Scaffold this active site. Structure first.
Site, PDB file in Angstrom:
ATOM      1  N   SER A  97      -0.704  15.523 -12.109  1.00 37.09           N
ATOM      2  CA  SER A  97      -0.951  15.154 -13.487  1.00 37.09           C
ATOM      3  C   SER A  97      -1.196  16.404 -14.315  1.00 37.09           C
ATOM      4  CB  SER A  97      -2.158  14.220 -13.550  1.00 37.09           C
ATOM      5  OG  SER A  97      -2.540  13.940 -14.886  1.00 37.09           O
ATOM      6  N   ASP A 112       0.819  -1.199   0.000  1.00 36.26           N
ATOM      7  CA  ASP A 112       0.000   0.000   0.000  1.00 36.26           C
ATOM      8  C   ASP A 112       0.861   1.260   0.000  1.00 36.26           C
ATOM      9  OD1 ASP A 112      -1.910   1.912   0.302  1.00 36.26           O
ATOM     10  OD2 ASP A 112      -2.437   1.389   2.370  1.00 36.26           O
TER      11      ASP A 112
END
Length: 330
Positions: free
Chosen positions: A199, A35
Site C-alpha cells: 500500500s 481464505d
C-alpha cells in the site's frame, strides 16, 4: 468457464463469510470460509472426532461415488489466530457457483481445534493463496483456483465482500457492474505464498494522506485490518476514550463513539473504509466498551488487509503468469 457464488456473513459483525461449495457425487453442500491467506481446502467430515463436531455439516466421502482416498497423504495446518486442524485426504469433484474441478484435493479433518468446533456456521476452509503453502504431505496439492485456472475464461477471481450483507466471489471474469470508477492494479510478491502487496499510505478521517509504503497481505480469511503500531495509534488517537487494552487484546473504544473513516492507498488510488466498518461491537455482552476493527500487527510479523479493508473494495486476484492485485471502489 466461470463461476459465481454468493458469500454471506456468519453473524451480525461480519466475523467471517461462508460460501456454499458442492463436494462429491451426489453433491454434498458445505459452507466454507474462502481464505486468500491459506492454501488448503479442508472440511469437517465423517472422520472428524465426534466430540469436536458441534453443528457443522460434514462431508462423508463413503457416500460420494467420485471420492478416492489419496493414499498416504496427510495434512496439518495452524493459523495465525492459533487455531488448527489435521487429517487425511481424498480427491473428489468440487464445484463453486457452477465452476467444477474434478480431482480436487479435499482434506478431511480428523481433528480440529476448539475455535473451529465452537463455530457451527463454518464447515471448513477453501484456501485461495498460492499452492506453495498447501500442507499436504508427502505430495503437496493444488488449490481450487490453481486447478481451475487453465479452464477459466480469464485466470482471475474476485472478492466482493459486503458490509453487514452478502457479497460475491467470482471465478474467471470481472463483473464490470460490481464497482465504480476504475480498477487500480498493483504488484504482488508470491515469495511468502500470499497475495502480498505494498500500500502507498493512509489517511485517518478527513485528515491528510500520509505517503508511506505498507507491505501486507490481502487476506479474506482474517476478520480485521492489522497495520503497524504507528498507523494504528494515529487512527485511535482520533477516537475519544479509545485505548489499547492488554487484557482485552487490542484497541477498544467507547461504544458511544462515532468512528472516523480510514483510507488506504493503492498506487495513486484510494480506498475509503467507512467508520462503521471498524466497529466490532461490545467486548462482552452488555459492555459499553467496543472492540476496534483496526489493530496492531506488531508481533504478527506481517500486516494483514483483512475483511475490514477488503469489504470496502472490489478486489481482483489476478493469477496471470505474473500475479497482480486490483482494487476498485464500489
Amino acid at each position: 468457464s466461470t463461476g459465481s457464488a454468493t458469500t454471506t456473513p456468519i453473524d451480525s459483525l461480519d466475523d467471517a463469510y461462508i460460501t456454499p461449495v458442492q463436494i462429491g457425487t451426489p453433491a454434498q453442500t458445505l459452507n466454507l470460509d474462502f481464505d486468500t491467506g491459506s492454501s488448503d481446502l479442508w472440511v469437517f467430515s465423517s472422520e472428524t472426532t465426534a466430540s469436536e463436531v458441534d453443528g457443522q455439516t460434514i462431508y462423508t466421502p463413503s457416500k460420494s461415488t467420485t471420492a478416492k482416498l489419496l493414499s498416504g497423504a496427510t495434512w496439518s495446518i495452524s493459523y495465525g489466530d492459533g487455531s488448527s486442524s489435521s487429517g487425511d485426504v481424498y480427491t473428489d469433484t468440487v464445484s463453486v457457483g457452477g465452476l467444477t474441478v474434478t480431482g480436487q484435493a479435499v482434506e478431511s479433518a480428523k481433528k480440529v481445534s476448539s475455535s473451529f468446533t465452537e463455530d457451527s456456521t463454518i464447515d471448513g476452509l477453501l484456501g485461495l493463496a498460492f499452492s506453495t503453502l498447501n500442507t499436504v504431505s508427502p505430495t503437496q496439492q493444488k488449490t481450487f483456483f490453481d486447478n481451475a485456472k487453465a479452464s477459466l475464461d480469464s485466470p482471475v477471481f474476485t472478492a466482493d465482500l459486503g458490509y453487514h450483507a452478502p457479497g460475491t466471489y467470482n471465478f474467471g471474469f470481472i463483473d464490470t457492474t460490481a464497482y465504480t470508477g476504475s480498477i487500480t492494479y498493483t504488484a504482488v510478491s508470491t515469495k511468502q505464498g500470499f497475495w502480498e502487496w505494498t500500500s502507498t499510505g493512509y489517511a485517518v478521517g478527513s485528515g491528510t494522506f500520509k505517503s508511506t509504503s505498507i507491505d501486507g497481505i490481502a487476506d479474506t480469511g482474517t476478520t480485521l485490518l492489522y497495520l503497524p503500531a504507528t498507523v494504528v495509534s494515529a487512527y485511535w488517537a482520533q477516537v475519544s476514550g479509545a485505548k489499547s487494552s492488554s487484557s482485552v487484546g487490542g484497541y477498544v473504544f467507547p461504544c458511544s463513539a462515532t468512528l472516523p473513516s480510514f483510507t488506504f492507498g493503492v498506487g495513486s488510488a484510494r480506498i475509503v473504509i467507512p467508520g462503521d466498518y471498524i466497529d466490532f461491537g461490545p467486548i462482552s455482552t452488555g459492555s459499553s466498551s467496543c472492540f476496534g476493527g483496526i489493530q496492531s500487527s506488531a508481533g504478527i510479523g506481517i500486516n494483514i488487509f483483512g475483511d475490514v479493508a477488503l469489504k470496502a473494495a472490489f478486489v481482483v486476484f489476478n493469477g496471470a503468469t505474473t500475479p497482480t492485485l486490483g482494487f476498485a471502489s464500489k
